[PDB]
Design a protein around this ligand. Structure first.
Ligand SMILES: N[C@@H](Cc1ccccc1)C(=O)O
Ligand SMILES: N[C@@H](Cc1ccccc1)C(=O)O
Ligand code: NA
Ligand code: NA
Ligand code: NA
Ligand code: NA
Lengths: 498, 495
């Protein structure tokens, strides 16, 4: 199935770790209403856009974003906007591989038996949260008092090295046959273990809450929080993150596929299985269990205190109250690691492809230098408090929605609305309904543009008053990354005409 | 002929700002004894070596250290060590241009009469230091109490922009005939002004000290601190800095010289001319006056609190007591600005020369991108406390004594001492005395290698115990710059 490779990179850490965080910190229910609208009016059509843009420029030997933007709009300002097609995946990879290494480190701990346990006599939210919170915080090195320096354990650093070595050895060697035999075993195993864990979580009855309260917290909307654009832009950004949109990823992969081929039905199918994997499996396992085990206030606080910490704290609590949970926990975090592994090798693909097709580097050299830029930068994420969340906000939330609007104007307003409508439907098994045409030309592009404006007039004053230097150094570091990548595209521009 | 071009290279901010700080920071006399030894055993021989390597490499179209090292020694490790010939000039330029902008800002202050004045009815050495300390600290934004974030004035930021604009213009359009007409008037005027100031300083007496006490501070040796390797490595590092050695700068300028011109006489004349402007002019004005005005305790404390601050505090105190001092303060800081301008366009030369010969960028593009890296990186030294001092130590002190040793190993142990001796003395008006053949081949490398080791086993443990996050981020940043420049050299080969 060709829809499984389109969802093998879509289903990853965003489904089981980022979604519970994004939903619980933004309210739940108040977050789900725009999250559904973003999937219909924004997420689905942009999937059709990036596959159409990619195979269009890919038919002329262009797999990189600046080369395709300039092919769709001949202007040096288009190649500058194409740098986000390299900057966003690079910044996300700086922490994504690190979060991926957390799942491998937890899998090794569960296999060997090092698991967190609830206290003997607690039966109150903060006391039973402490063993599971300290299990994660002492691994990633969270101190007390909001001190800016993290002290991760030596085991966590070594597991990060091993995770980098696994990503590099696959990007160089390629997809192996044993990996293909392991992938066809992990896809049912993940979507069978997920079935049991939805049943297990549903009958959770604790003195601190019920799973029914977690589903009540997640599916009852608060309409006064719909006036908050930070809730809206967190929802439209999570849609882009989970669908692998707003990066430079999908446009690079359609460059390697063929024209006169279906990008409509298969593009709609992988976008649905992915939402089935995180709304049902990623959303009704982690969130209701956190509300049942720790209550609402503590579940929201854990979600606000990190970008991926909720699932790492909630799932071991489930497995501590389940017969054989230590074994199932090994399966959970090892399969979650494989989900992140197939995504991280995909996130780092546009950067490696740029060093190949534009700077004429070999596979071995393009991979190893890309890994050097990720490993070196990851030390900010590993050792600076809130540095990981900052990269996740500007690349994984704000960056994807700005770069998603940019794609929707270059391809649908400058390249031609009717001209782009033909590129989407070519070879389609089914046809895109006519109502999406007016949505892609007048509704969605004139909605993301308004959201970023109504958001920036309210939160940018709060952002520029940031007091933590660990945050400003991260903002300074990622600006240097965008300038560094702009310099690389310049070296490619003075090489094509040289 | 070309001696004045080497003197516009050498004579700069290291002569009048850094040398007073480096000497007063380690004591003086205890600093000058290894300083004179470093000029004879290290500075002079490595001046001839960099000029000889540049010619031999420039004759084949190479002007940067990664390509010239690989030409003399065909190894992967040669191009990696050649990155320092790009990294040290880049790191130094990150803060050198900013220090250059200070002299321009003070020149504008003194032109319009915004001068610091000592308080009346007070001879307290802390009360008279206070307004001169505040004049600099309010400009560069030093807070009270070791806070990590600097807050320099808006005027200091705008003047930095203009200093960047002046460097970019001259680097693109070249040295105009109007400013070449200016250099022949400015550098003589600076020498005449400095000879006047040392006469003025020598006639200083205060209720807190005299200038004769200052000369006793700088020239009376202390033999207990002669066993401190940090003092030895600061004197050797200063010799490299003031003579423009230990960079890839002299090698790039030598890459345009014919292989049959004179190196020995012209290089020895420029080095000695530079030292006269440093110990006789720069060192004899700032330090004796700081001791006379503020005392020895404060002169050492100011030298340790910053990397270039002492000259900016001491000199306006001199001008506050001299008739016509505000006008003389204008000419001093303006000719000090021009002395830094001709030096900073030479510092950014290896980076520009690497973006053209390799990577095949135009002159307009190589200057603007080099100016972008420097301008971006300068915000660390502008806003993070002790970041400027950290870059100045690892590049301007430790890096130069390491890269100078590296140039010496590859040219006299790998390329061949008999071939290098033939290449230095080729076309020379006079010949190098035979005693330097054994200094270059045996004495100098055995001296620099030992000095680096004994320094590293007495100070690396204290370096790893840093308590300021602002210095670890600077160390993290400059490691990133070296990896970045190693990536560009890699892109040069596979082009
Ligand atoms: N969509 C993936 C992340 C990803 C983005 C871009 C390319 C590949 C993967 C996730 O939710 O985990
Ligand atoms: N030697 C100069 C600095 C410099 C170094 C290298 C090249 C050019 C200038 C000084 O003392 O100020
Ligand atoms: Na995946
Ligand atoms: Na996903
Ligand atoms: Na000098
Ligand atoms: Na100069």
């Amino acid at each position: 199935g060709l829809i499984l490779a389109m969802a093998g990179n879509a289903v990853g850490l965003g489904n089981f770790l980022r979604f519970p965080v994004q939903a619980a910190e933004n309210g739940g229910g108040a977050f789900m209403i725009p999250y559904i609208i973003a999937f219909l009016l924004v997420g689905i059509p942009l999937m059709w856009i990036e596959w159409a843009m990619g195979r269009y420029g890919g038919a002329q030997g262009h797999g990189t974003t600046p080369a395709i933007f300039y092919l769709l709009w001949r202007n040096r300002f288009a190649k500058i906007l194409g740098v986000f097609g390299l900057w966003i995946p690079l910044v996300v990879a700086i922490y994504y591989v690190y979060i991926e290494s957390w799942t491998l480190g937890f899998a090794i701990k569960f296999l060997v038996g090092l698991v967190p346990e609830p206290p003997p006599n607690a039966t109150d939210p903060d006391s039973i949260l402490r063993p599971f919170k300290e299990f994660l915080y002492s691994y990633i090195g969270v101190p007390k008092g909001d001190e800016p320096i993290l002290k991760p354990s030596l085991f966590a650093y070594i597991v990060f090295l091993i995770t980098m070595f696994i990503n590099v050895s696959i990007l160089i060697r390629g997809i192996s046959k044993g990996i293909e035999r392991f992938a066809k075993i992990a896809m049912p195993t993940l979507f069978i273990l997920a079935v049991f864990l939805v049943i297990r979580v549903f009958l959770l009855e604790t003195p601190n809450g019920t799973a029914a309260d977690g589903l009540n917290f997640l599916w009852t909307p608060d309409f006064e929080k719909l006036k908050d654009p930070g809730v809206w832009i967190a929802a439209v950004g999570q849609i882009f993150f989970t669908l692998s949109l707003g990066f430079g990823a999908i446009i690079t992969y359609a460059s390697y596929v063929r024209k006169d081929q279906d990008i409509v039905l298969s593009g709609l199918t992988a976008a649905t299985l992915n939402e089935k994997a995180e709304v049902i499996l990623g959303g009704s396992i982690s969130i209701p269990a956190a509300v049942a085990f720790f209550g609402v206030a503590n579940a929201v606080a854990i979600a606000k205190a990190g970008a991926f910490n909720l699932g790492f704290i909630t799932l071991p609590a489930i497995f501590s109250q389940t017969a054989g949970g230590t074994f199932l926990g090994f399966l959970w975090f090892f399969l979650l690691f494989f989900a992140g592994l197939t995504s991280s090798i995909a996130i780092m693909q546009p950067m490696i492809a740029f060093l190949e097709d534009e700077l004429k580097l070999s596979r071995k050299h393009a991979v190893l230098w890309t890994a050097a830029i990720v490993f070196f930068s990851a030390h900010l994420v590993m050792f600076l408090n809130k540095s990981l969340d900052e990269m996740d906000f500007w690349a994984g939330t704000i960056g994807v929605v700005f770069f998603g609007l940019t794609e929707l104007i270059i391809f649908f307003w400058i390249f031609g609305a009717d001209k782009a409508w033909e590129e989407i439907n070519r070879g389609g098994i089914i046809k895109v309904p006519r109502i999406y045409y007016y949505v892609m030309r007048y509704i969605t592009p004139a909605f993301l543009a308004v959201l970023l404006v109504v958001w920036a007039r309210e939160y940018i004053p709060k952002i520029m008053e940031e007091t933590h230097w660990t945050v400003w150094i991260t903002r300074f570091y990622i600006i240097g990354l965008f300038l560094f990548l702009t310099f690389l595209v310049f070296l490619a521009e003075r090489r094509r005409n040289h």
